Design a protein around this ligand. Structure first.
Ligand SMILES: Nc1ncnc2c1ncn2[C@@H]1O[C@H](COP(=O)(O)OP(=O)(O)NP(=O)(O)O)[C@@H](O)[C@H]1O
Lengths: 229, 93
């Protein structure tokens, strides 16, 4: 299924930070952690954060192929699956040697081109699909665009809670953070500061059912392509 | 999912009430379980709903052909060898 990440145990992992973990009873030497991380799934990854700290150390992509034994034509995103990449092609030493050669060659290319910096290298498909995912997984904007076009603020947070449970899943929220994100969201033209010392909005509609308003290589892409590549 | 589809369904009815209806149908017909509505949307697109697939002015790919139900409303529109099977039989076997 699809699970939430809760934004714990993540930034610490994403950052190469040394940690004196293990040896609960005793004490294991603080070990530095340095490992490239990759996460893939057939399902979706639920994210629950908005801070610039998050959404900045993340990269998103989506595949565009599928392999099956009945490769129906007229679909470019479909190929005859090979039931041999798994049961063999893994234990053969020579293929592993070739793959290792590919990896070392690519690392050498990266080092000699971008001086070891994976952030400086530019991919238009990346950093566009990523912000496309950013436009999703931010359910507050979806709720605002779906239900609202002074009603105080408790009604707003309760409406968000009921909308989220229905639209997404029954989950628990806290009203304060929802309010502060509301002043962090696109509501300031409506959000105001009441003389009764209660931050409230204006022009609030509560809908119920329907209320209206690049290039390709010759034959060797591993030639690194030109400088833009 | 397909049992519910060709058991209770034969406006656009939105989709939140659809996911809640499937949830309660599954709880009653099968077992009490919570379903995340996004998933149900993905399998609904994967299920037989393309003919009913539609769109909403609030940027929501929506459904059609919906038949509501909450009670007893009902439909409201080879061979054998001689004696040696272990002989493996011929190539078709
Ligand atoms: N380029 C390729 N050419 C031919 N067959 C391929 C290619 N890439 C993958 N396959 C095959 O397609 C399948 C890949 O599916 P895969 O993602 O591994 O399934 P999965 O959902 O991850 N779990 P599993 O089905 O057990 O492997 C394997 O059977 C591969 O042998």
């Amino acid at each position: 299924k699809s699970e939430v990440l809760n934004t714990s145990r993540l930034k610490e992992m994403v950052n190469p930070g040394d940690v004196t973990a293990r040896e609960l009873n005793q004490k294991q030497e603080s070990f530095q952690m340095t490992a490239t991380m990759v996460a893939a799934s057939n399902y979706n990854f639920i994210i629950d954060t908005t801070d610039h700290g998050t959404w900045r150390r993340l990269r998103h992509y989506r595949s565009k192929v599928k392999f099956c034994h009945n490769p129906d034509p007229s679909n470019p995103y479909e190929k005859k699956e090979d039931p041999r990449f798994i049961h063999e092609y893994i234990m053969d030493p020579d293929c592993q040697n070739a793959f290792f050669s590919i990896l070392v060659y690519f690392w050498e290319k990266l080092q000699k081109e971008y001086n070891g910096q994976i952030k400086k290298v530019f991919c238009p498909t990346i950093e566009s699909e990523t912000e496309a995912y950013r436009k999703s997984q931010d359910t507050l904007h979806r709720f605002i665009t779906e239900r609202v076009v002074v009603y105080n603020l408790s009604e707003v947070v309760t409406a968000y809670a009921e909308w989220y449970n229905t639209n997404i899943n029954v989950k628990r929220h806290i009203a304060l953070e929802l309010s502060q994100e509301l002043e962090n969201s696109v509501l300031e033209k409506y959000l105001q500061w009441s003389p009764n010392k209660t931050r409230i909005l204006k022009g609030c509609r509560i809908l119920h059912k329907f209320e209206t308003l690049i290039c390709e290589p010759k034959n060797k892409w591993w030639e690194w392509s030109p400088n833009p590549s | 999912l397909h049992r519910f589809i060709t058991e209770r369904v034969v406006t656009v009815y939105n989709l939140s009430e659809v996911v809640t209806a499937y949830a309660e149908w599954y709880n009653t017909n099968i077992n009490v379980k919570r379903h995340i509505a996004l998933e149900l949307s993905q399998e609904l697109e994967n299920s037989v709903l393309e003919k009913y697939l539609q769109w909403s002015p609030n940027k929501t790919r929506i459904l059609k052909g919906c038949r509501i139900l909450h009670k007893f409303e009902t439909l409201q529109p080879i061979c054998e060898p001689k004696n040696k099977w272990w002989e493996w039989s011929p190539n078709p076997s």
